[PDB]
Ligand binder design. Structure first.
Ligand SMILES: Cc1cc2nc3c(=O)[nH]c(=O)nc-3n(C[C@H](O)[C@H](O)[C@H](O)COP(=O)(O)OP(=O)(O)OC[C@H]3O[C@@H](n4cnc5c(N)ncnc54)[C@H](O)[C@@H]3O)c2cc1C
Ligand SMILES: Cc1cc2nc3c(=O)[nH]c(=O)nc-3n(C[C@H](O)[C@H](O)[C@H](O)COP(=O)(O)OP(=O)(O)OC[C@H]3O[C@@H](n4cnc5c(N)ncnc54)[C@H](O)[C@@H]3O)c2cc1C
Ligand SMILES: NC(=O)C1=CN([C@@H]2O[C@H](COP(=O)(O)OP(=O)(O)OC[C@H]3O[C@@H](n4cnc5c(N)ncnc54)[C@H](OP(=O)(O)O)[C@@H]3O)[C@@H](O)[C@H]2O)C=CC1
Ligand SMILES: NC(=O)C1=CN([C@@H]2O[C@H](COP(=O)(O)OP(=O)(O)OC[C@H]3O[C@@H](n4cnc5c(N)ncnc54)[C@H](OP(=O)(O)O)[C@@H]3O)[C@@H](O)[C@H]2O)C=CC1
Ligand SMILES: N[C@@H](CCC(=O)N[C@@H](CSSC[C@H](NC(=O)CC[C@H](N)C(=O)O)C(=O)NCC(=O)O)C(=O)NCC(=O)O)C(=O)O
Ligand SMILES: N[C@@H](CCC(=O)N[C@@H](CSSC[C@H](NC(=O)CC[C@H](N)C(=O)O)C(=O)NCC(=O)O)C(=O)NCC(=O)O)C(=O)O
Lengths: 462, 462
């Protein structure tokens, strides 16, 4: 027998939870299928525990400036286990909250792994029971990528971000491989907390898809903070030794000859090279649901799959892999399906991002190079500044703040904002609202500054 | 003999410096008269040294959460002199920078006290030499208010914010009198750094001209932080004792009888009750320049005095006593006079403010009560939230974040934003740009959130 619902959601992470809760508000009879822990990647092995560890890493820098600010320094060591336990308890509190959010909304929780059946009417099976609905959302997320053994023998001796959140002790020596925001964030946390840390990157700079100013500055701040950035470098092999792992690296700097280097006595090797969508065991083939070669579910601008009555949102689609994007796409879909708003969809332009580096990065809109491509070089003007935040006026340790505003056409429409510096994590949201509204530079310059702040520098560029 | 300029600016603080520099960019032959230190109140006894001391007071709270974040605590004491010396050096660096800014712009620096003469053509005298121009800006600022002895015998035993910045040691016991942002800020700094601190206020709450939510929350956070808030209380007399000062207080709570209390062994009594404009010795009468009963120079919307060719900006006019306001009004005036832009003026609506409390406050636009008065009760809707920032998910000490959005008319135009919480100091500027642009709630809700942050809560209110 087959139980019918108005809305069946596969995955109880950011996007699935948000979509199911909004549908239920509109009257849908909904169910969420979850094989592991409610809250998905964000709550369990993502945004939330990452941010707790970032706040911890900030405590390591307050510690270094304490004498400069008039206090006698602290001179004793970090205890990873203390914060690990507290972090785990917070995750458990959130798991209980999201279970209650579904129950309070009268959303059924189906525990187990869903896969599609070959029934012509779209139907899933979970633990040998069948469920159907006229609307089925796939919101199954992704997972970390690890190299194949055939490519990098010994790769399985490394961990990913998932294993990072299982660590019970600070690794003495860490090597992080990759050059995106997860690699950056994990390297910065491990180094701030006292691991002897290297970040191994294929080119000269991290965050190369970000504005060139951010890519440069982020790389410089990593080095200034004590992270060893191993440029033009790749792992060839990993071996277990008596003292941890030995990582065999090849370095090939332009203008130089390639060189092989062994990195001995590594405690933690962390692969932060990408994410793979979680679709292998969904039986998508049984209904002919379209994927790319990497397993991402293909969707249109309304989150429709190629099969009527089946949708997908969030990381499983491979576009803009952020919690607020999954949530917004999920809610817009709920209003389309259950409020009959045919034009309800997410705009994927001007989505803001923060990277929790040291100091944090904020960006929204087009890089300078993207703007030149779209508008023409003669129709783009940039304004920028670099300064030392007043926090550091009295400290021996320094960080900088860099900001870039990208403007298009005669009116100087603000089409991109890019920055790194103290406070940039909390500064960006409001500027993103202004950019989404089509703010011009005149709109920024007509807004009176707030002094003394870093944020005022964005409204006083000349 | 009389030297002539295009532009004569009386006072080398925020507004005078900004106005003179912009005029000189437009070709004006300008001079700045300064009797004390370039940079005025902001650089020397205001924004800048206040902010250094606020950053210091934040170091006192990182210290209290260090064990919770896995570090062994710091257990030794603050040394006021360390940071005082560093703070003074930074002020000296800024004095040298602003002198150079004028010199590099070919702006003459006239050192001494200016007063108007009785010459029918507006002319000032400084150290017995006369100067004239077709455009004279009065930008002389203000000074702290202290009670008259006739009113409060012994009031002169107290200090003001000026004396705060001369303190060479942390006072053991401090009593701050007043209920505005300076009183709040000074009480919070002194208490965080270890002074046994009381804040004496005439009514039940601080910041009563701010939105009611902020007034309430700020008072609660002061008390939670250990500041003793002495409500419905006023100073009657101050006496020198063997052990500091004795403050005689009268307390008169509604519903209760008045009571007199002596507060013994006070080391620092700080008056933070208002500001008086710096106009007493300008000889304004010699030209009939109009003032109010408190000595403020009266101006129109274009900063004109009642006398042709004479202007005033900044604190001397008594309206919106902030550094960015003096600067913006000064620059808009320079473009009016020297770029002939007859409509160039400052809009005094939607000026954003931050109060450096613990945690900081940010506000822009109308309070809920101001919006109801302007638009009608049936045409105002508020949205609000209160939460604990994720920073405190793992700490025993707590602070809250409260946010209020005030919306007008069917379209829900955002006419006010009010908040207190970690990060609110850097969060506000961008939201102020959106409000100045006429953002609606739909504009906020159409902007994708940044997670995990406090700032995302302002774009996800329901
Ligand atoms: C280390 C790290 C840090 C990050 N930091 C941030 C950050 O600061 N900010 C930000 O915005 N984003 C961040 N992200 C990204 C964010 O976590 C993801 O974009 C977001 O979780 C994706 O949500 P989702 O709904 O697509 O998938 P997920 O949250 O991954 O949820 C998918 C759910 O589906 C369940 N599932 C899968 N297959 C099945 C099946 N067949 N049957 C039943 N259940 C199934 C899974 O168990 C899971 O709970 C971070 C991610 C990582 C890994
Ligand atoms: C404790 C405190 C904290 C503050 N915190 C902030 C803050 O965080 N943010 C913010 O925006 N604002 C803050 N302010 C307010 C800010 O300092 C003032 O709004 C701003 O300095 C006013 O600028 P102004 O140009 O009007 O006057 P001022 O900067 O006061 O400059 C006037 C100048 O005129 C000179 N002068 C006066 N009379 C004469 C004369 N006849 N001849 C020659 N020279 C003369 C004075 O010596 C002085 O240098 C703070 C103020 C105080 C007191
Ligand atoms: N400007 C913006 O607004 C941007 C926002 N983002 C946001 O961040 C999300 C995640 O992006 P991002 O952090 O770039 O993600 P990635 O998962 O793509 O980052 C991993 C990076 O590591 C490198 N890498 C890939 N494979 C290997 C390998 N086999 N060995 C070593 N290194 C490898 C690549 O960088 P390299 O080529 O340098 O080696 C790659 O970009 C996006 O989906 C988007 O939401 C991302 C980019 C820009
Ligand atoms: N909502 C907004 O946007 C607001 C912004 N601001 C900004 O802040 C600037 C400064 O304002 P604010 O901090 O209010 O300034 P004030 O200098 O006016 O604050 C001093 C306060 O102390 C109290 N006080 C006055 N005289 C006495 C006395 N004799 N004894 C004891 N207490 C006394 C009063 O409060 P009480 O009546 O409670 O006793 C008074 O408001 C403004 O010019 C503006 O730029 C100010 C208000 C609102
Ligand atoms: N704001 C950042 C950076 C620190 C910073 O601002 N430091 C400068 C001194 S600030 S105090 C004097 C005041 N300046 C302002 O209010 C900023 C004006 C803004 N730049 C603008 O263009 O509107 C003032 O009196 N200005 C009058 C004038 O600008 O003419 C500074 O000088 N830095 C230079 C240095 O080398 O230190 C933060 O707070 O971190
Ligand atoms: N953001 C502040 C406050 C801390 C906070 O957000 N805590 C909550 C858990 S966040 S992780 C799960 C994620 N939630 C979000 O991305 C926020 C969505 C936002 N509220 C919105 O409405 O868009 C998610 O999976 N959400 C899916 C869903 O919302 O359905 C939390 O639960 N707090 C409650 C508590 O009692 O702790 C900060 O970062 O400080």
């Amino acid at each position: 027998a087959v139980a019918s619902y108005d809305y069946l959601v596969i995955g109880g992470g950011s996007g699935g939870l948000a979509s199911a809760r909004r549908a239920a508000e509109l009257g849908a009879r909904a169910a969420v299928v979850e094989s592991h822990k409610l809250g998905g990647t964000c709550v369990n092995v993502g945004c939330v525990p990452k941010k707790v560890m970032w706040n911890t890493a900030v405590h390591s820098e307050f510690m270094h400036d304490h004498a400069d600010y008039g206090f006698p320094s602290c001179e004793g060591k970090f205890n990873w286990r203390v914060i690990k336990e507290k972090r785990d308890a917070y995750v458990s509190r959130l798991n209980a909250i999201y279970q209650n959010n579904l129950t309070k909304s009268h959303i059924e929780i189906i525990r187990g792994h869903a896969a599609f059946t070959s029934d012509p009417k779209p139907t899933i099976e979970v633990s040998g029971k069948k469920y159907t609905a006229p609307h089925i959302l796939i919101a199954t997320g992704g997972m970390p990528s690890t190299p194949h053994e055939s490519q990098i023998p010994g790769a399985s001796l490394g961990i990913t971000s998932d294993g990072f959140f299982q660590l019970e002790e600070l690794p003495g020596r860490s090597v992080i491989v990759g050059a995106g925001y997860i690699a950056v964030e994990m390297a910065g946390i491990l180094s701030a907390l006292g691991s002897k840390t290297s970040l191994m990157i294929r080119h000269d700079k991290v965050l190369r898809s970000f504005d060139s100013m951010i890519s440069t500055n982020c790389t410089e701040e990593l080095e200034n903070a004590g992270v060893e950035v191993l440029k033009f470098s790749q792992v060839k092999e990993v071996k277990k030794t008596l003292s941890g792992l030995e990582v065999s690296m090849v370095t090939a700097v332009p203008g130089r000859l390639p060189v092989m280097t062994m990195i001995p006595d590594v405690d933690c090797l962390l692969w932060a090279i990408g994410r793979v969508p979680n679709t292998k065991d969904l039986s998508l083939n049984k209904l002919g649901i379209q994927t790319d070669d990497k397993g991402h579910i293909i969707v249109d601008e309304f989150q429709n799959t190629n099969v009527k009555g089946i949708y997908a949102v969030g990381d499983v689609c491979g576009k803009a892999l952020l919690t607020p994007v999954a949530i917004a796409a999920g809610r817009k879909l709920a209003h389309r399906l259950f409020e009959y708003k045919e034009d309800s969809k997410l705009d994927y332009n001007n989505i803001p991002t923060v990277v929790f580096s040291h100091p944090p990065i904020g960006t929204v809109g087009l890089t300078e190079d993207e703007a030149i491509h779209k508008y023409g070089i003669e129709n783009v003007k940039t304004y920028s500044t670099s300064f030392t935040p007043m926090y550091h006026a009295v400290t021996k340790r320094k960080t900088k703040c860099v900001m870039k505003m990208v403007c298009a056409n005669k009116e100087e429409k603000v089409v991109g904002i890019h920055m790194q510096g103290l406070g940039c994590d909390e500064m960006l949201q409001g500027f993103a609202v202004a950019v989404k509204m089509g703010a011009t530079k005149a709109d920024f310059d007509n807004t009176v500054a707030i002094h003394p702040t870093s944020s005022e520098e964005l409204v006083t560029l000349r």
